Amino acid sequence: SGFRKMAFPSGKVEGCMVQVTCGTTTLNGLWLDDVVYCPRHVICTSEDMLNPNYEDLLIRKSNHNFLVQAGNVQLRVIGHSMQNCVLKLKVDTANPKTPKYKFVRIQPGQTFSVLACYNGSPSGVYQCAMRPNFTIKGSFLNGSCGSVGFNIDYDCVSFCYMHHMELPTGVHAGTDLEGNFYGPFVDRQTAQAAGTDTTITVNVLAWLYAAVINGDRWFLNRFTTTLNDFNLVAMKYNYEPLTQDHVDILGPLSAQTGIAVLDMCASLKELLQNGMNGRTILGSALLEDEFTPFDVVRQCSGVT
Amino acid sequence: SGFRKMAFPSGKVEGCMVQVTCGTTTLNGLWLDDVVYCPRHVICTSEDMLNPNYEDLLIRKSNHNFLVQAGNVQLRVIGHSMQNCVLKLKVDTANPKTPKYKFVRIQPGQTFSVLACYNGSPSGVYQCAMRPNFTIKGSFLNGSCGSVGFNIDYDCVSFCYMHHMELPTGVHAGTDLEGNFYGPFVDRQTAQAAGTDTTITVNVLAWLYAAVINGDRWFLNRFTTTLNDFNLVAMKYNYEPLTQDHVDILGPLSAQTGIAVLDMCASLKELLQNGMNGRTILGSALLEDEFTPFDVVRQCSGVT
Numbered sequence A, B: 001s002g003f004r005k006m007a008f009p010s011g012k013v014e015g016c017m018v019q020v021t022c023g024t025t026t027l028n029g030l031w032l033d034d035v036v037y038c039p040r041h042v043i044c045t046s047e048d049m050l051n052p053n054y055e056d057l058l059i060r061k062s063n064h065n066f067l068v069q070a071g072n073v074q075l076r077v078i079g080h081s082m083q084n085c086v087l088k089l090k091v092d093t094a095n096p097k098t099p100k101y102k103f104v105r106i107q108p109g110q111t112f113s114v115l116a117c118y119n120g121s122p123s124g125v126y127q128c129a130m131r132p133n134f135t136i137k138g139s140f141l142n143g144s145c146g147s148v149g150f151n152i153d154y155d156c157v158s159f160c161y162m163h164h165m166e167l168p169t170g171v172h173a174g175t176d177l178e179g180n181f182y183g184p185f186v187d188r189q190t191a192q193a194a195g196t197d198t199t200i201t202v203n204v205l206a207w208l209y210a211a212v213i214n215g216d217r218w219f220l221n222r223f224t225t226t227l228n229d230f231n232l233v234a235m236k237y238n239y240e241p242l243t244q245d246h247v248d249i250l251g252p253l254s255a256q257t258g259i260a261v262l263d264m265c266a267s268l269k270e271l272l273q274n275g276m277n278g279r280t281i282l283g284s285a286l287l288e289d290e291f292t293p294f295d296v297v298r299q300c301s302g303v304t
């Protein structure tokens, strides 16, 4: 038993972390096969930061201006291209440590592991969720750009996130591995509206199922609700609307505990309308939405 | 910016995880050099579980009864010994993936990374703290025994914890890598008093320093206190007494923020006596004690 914010083992991804230097700027790259992927703002000076013309800036750059370093060995850049907001530097050596991988675009409410890197060196790993407003509440300092988010299915690493920037609000924005930003964000040092963030209702419910499994049952009640009634409370409290798909994905946790999904929604409804009254659920004094039903299922079943 | 419960990159430790089978029991082992370390209760049947005579049980076991498997390759056990509550199985092959390592005994209040394993396979990684009552609030299911806790200084992995058992209270107990249990716990399926757990006061203060650095300053006040006055509040609220050593270790965070340590104790004193009033500090509705001053310093400075 026990419930923790668990990240995937990061080893398969530490082997792909490299340092990318272009001019006086240094950030992290992702070396898979003979390609190193990195944020295209690596070619930025502090003058053009406000609104860069990346095509023109890249045109002044040649293979030999990108310096790719893996720990201590220099990689030979034989090609360079821009794919949306990422650079794909072609190198003459395939990464011997390349795992089985896919590049995937995750959906809001989905969770992934982040490997924070500085100078191509992994410094830590944490689990986070893509907020419905397409931001992540991560932990990143100067030099963290190019740090990736991923999931791991047995031996296959699905890369979903590349770190690009921090919004003035302290939240983080980045792209998928094809350079497509999650959200309306652009790689410009300009004021960007983060957007209204809602709570991932299916995930809070999944985390309530983990609480029942792990001993915490104080919040459980004699009440029930309908999807329509519950959603009125979710709208009031800026929670994501609960759909029948969400009810389906919660089927396994409903079966494991014996608590019908709408009975858990009623417990959640009361927690929203009345608060925790100074009590805790799984060691927390607030409702947690960064655990998907798959995460709770995995952490309470034991998938390696 | 951003504050997350960050674990160390787990790669160096995934390379040392093996499966240890003895009879019908399977748990995890730690392969460093030509030795595999594992919990000695691997030699237990379900009859002797209540009070095993481990010397007698080990006497009925020979090298060939311990099955060490690393992914798919079988290791040849050429020796076996009991060191406190761990078995040291000598194998004919040195682990090619052995990192620079030390075996260290951590102190209560100290934090480490755990790599949870099932069948010698890493399934996830999380950061936790050794509670003052020498327990850890981890996340472990059947087959997790032999999962280790560690810290990483640049390239050197300091192993500090080996997972052994779950107390009926849902908290976890285990040994250092020499087999010495943290706390009064014994490797017996018997009722064991967990002990009173206090809050790691220096760590909560360090986490309050991280909050100021990361933007959260609502809790800051015009008051101050003395070490003696503050400690009266800490005693009342079951917090660890704050010593002058704790004040010294907080010197760097005090210098970074400009807030004298006793001014932060006064903010903490008010939070203890008045609560958060429904507000949050670093995304949490309770005071967090699982970040040491070194962890906050590292996460707010960027050490890789």
Ligand SMILES: O=C(c1cc(=O)[nH]c2ccccc12)N1CCN(c2cccc(C(F)(F)F)c2)CC1
Binding pocket: A041, A044, A049, A140, A141, A142, A143, A144, A145, A164, A165, A166, A172, A186, A187, A188, A189, A190, B001
């Ligand atoms: O490493 C970081 C950074 C990331 C982060 O998430 N948090 C921080 C907190 C404090 C200081 C720096 C950071 N940088 C340097 C590169 N930066 C940059 C440069 C050129 C152009 C752009 C662009 F986004 F506008 F394209 C962006 C973005 C900020």
Ligand SMILES: O=C(c1cc(=O)[nH]c2ccccc12)N1CCN(c2cccc(C(F)(F)F)c2)CC1
Binding pocket: A001, B041, B044, B049, B140, B141, B142, B143, B144, B145, B164, B165, B166, B172, B186, B187, B188, B189, B190
């Ligand atoms: O893998 C686990 C386990 C660990 C854990 O932390 N949480 C769990 C939650 C649900 C089910 C099992 C566990 N086991 C199996 C081996 N066990 C054992 C066997 C023989 C002797 C002993 C001894 F501690 F008494 F020595 C202990 C201890 C429990």
